[PDB]
């Protein structure tokens, strides 16, 4: 029944004022892309930065197993668009937020399916 909870541990570390994980790999791009959350190539728009996915995944960066039962990673081998206002903590961002399964934007940072 025991299972380390890294997601929760990082959330609590951040709350307590800890420094966010650094050395997330930021890409050069046009910043005129689709704005979708997770893509096969950088797609940042004017309000986002694009990052190499593995470097923004808590589980990849901490050398722990991924939540998925098959262990698959959502971010590894792809690019994750992070709002520029949040790009000081890409790992925090991808953990806390979720991607609309319909339009592919971040729920709350581009997804207008709810309007």
């Amino acid at each position: 029944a025991f299972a380390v909870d890294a997601a929760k541990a990082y959330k609590d570390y951040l709350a307590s004022g800890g420094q966010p994980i650094t050395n997330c790999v930021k890409m050069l791009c046009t910043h005129t892309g689709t704005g979708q959350a997770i893509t096969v190539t950088p797609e940042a728009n004017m309000d986002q930065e694009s990052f190499g996915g593995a470097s923004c995944c808590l589980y990849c960066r901490c050398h722990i197993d991924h939540p998925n039962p098959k262990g698959f990673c959502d971010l590894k081998g792809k690019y994750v668009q992070i709002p520029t206002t949040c790009a000081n903590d890409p790992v925090g961002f991808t953990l806390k937020n979720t991607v609309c399964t319909v339009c592919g934007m971040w729920k709350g940072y581009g997804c207008s399916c709810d309007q």
Partner: protein
């Protein structure tokens, strides 16, 4: 005008000299480029390298196979691999490797000395940023280095598809004479210096379109001396200008043709096509790799 390029390539006339090796003395040694906000040196470096490779006649087949040695950083991540994956067509098989553990966007990653790395298949593009900082010793003579350079020369001769290309990082002290000699086995070659790292004796030795046999005979001791002569007499202005224009960055998926072929079948018309970036010669089977593990029981 070179400040708007991604970097500067060795001019052909310097390649044709017969200089003696001198110490490398760069005017702007210690200076650094101003990078865009939050961009790492190694992302910028690899971006300019790929920007320069976009100007060459690279073969870009469907189901391209690329391997990247020296891909880990002291950060535990793989900035260069991320640029390569952005540059290469979607779906390109990308394998990377380094001596120490790191997390990467490559499709498969092998940890260990490069000599432990084995692959069944041939590759269309080989990138190496392998480098040992201890080779830099200004108080001792600067001789051709072996180590991973010996592995790289073997890997190229045995596992690079005809028509494929390489880019291998060297410096004033990190270099190998046979690697330069092997540049003469490509249809064209150069030493390319990124504008962001122009204050360093680093360069990427690039071989464009592998032919499997010498097109020209190169003395590698002499050619490294020629390289240092060029660097010593041609200051390069640090510049990050090319990083701000990524509209044309992606490698064009040329759909280059792949053929299996045997040594007797490589005629001059084939060699013509290889030289123009129009043909890749290798099997198209499954890509399988492995790394040797040394087994030891230290108990007693």
């Amino acid at each position: 005008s070179q400040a708007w390029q991604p970097g500067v390539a060795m001019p052909n006339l310097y390649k044709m000299q017969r200089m003696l090796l001198e110490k490398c003395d760069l005017q702007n040694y210690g200076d650094s480029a101003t990078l865009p906000k939050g961009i790492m040196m190694n992302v910028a470096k690899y971006t300019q390298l790929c920007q320069y490779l976009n100007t060459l006649t690279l073969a870009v087949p469907y189901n391209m196979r690329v391997i990247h040695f020296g891909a880990g950083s002291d950060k535990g991540v793989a900035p260069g691999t991320a640029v390569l994956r952005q540059w290469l067509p979607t779906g390109t098989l990308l394998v990377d490797s380094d001596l120490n553990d790191f997390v990467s966007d490559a499709d498969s990653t092998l940890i260990g000395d490069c000599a432990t790395v084995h692959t069944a298949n041939k590759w269309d593009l080989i990138i190496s940023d392998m480098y040992d900082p201890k080779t830099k010793n200004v108080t001792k003579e600067n001789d051709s280095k072996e180590g991973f350079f010996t592995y790289i020369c073997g890997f190229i001769q045995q596992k690079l598809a005809l028509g494929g290309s390489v880019a291998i990082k060297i410096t004033e002290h990190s270099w190998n004479a046979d690697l330069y000699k092997l540049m003469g086995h490509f249809a064209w070659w150069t030493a390319f210096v990124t504008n962001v790292n122009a204050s360093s004796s680093e360069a990427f030795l690039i071989g464009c379109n592998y032919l499997g046999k010498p097109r020209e005979q190169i003395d590698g001791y002499v050619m490294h001396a020629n390289y240092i002569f060029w660097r010593n007499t041609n200051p390069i202005q640090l510049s990050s200008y090319s990083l701000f224009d990524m509209s044309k960055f992606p490698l064009k998926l040329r759909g280059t043709a792949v053929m299996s072929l045997k040594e007797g079948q490589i005629n001059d018309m084939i060699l013509s096509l290889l030289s123009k970036g129009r043909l890749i010669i290798r099997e198209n089977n499954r890509v399988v790799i492995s790394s040797d593990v040394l087994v030891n029981n230290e108990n007693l």
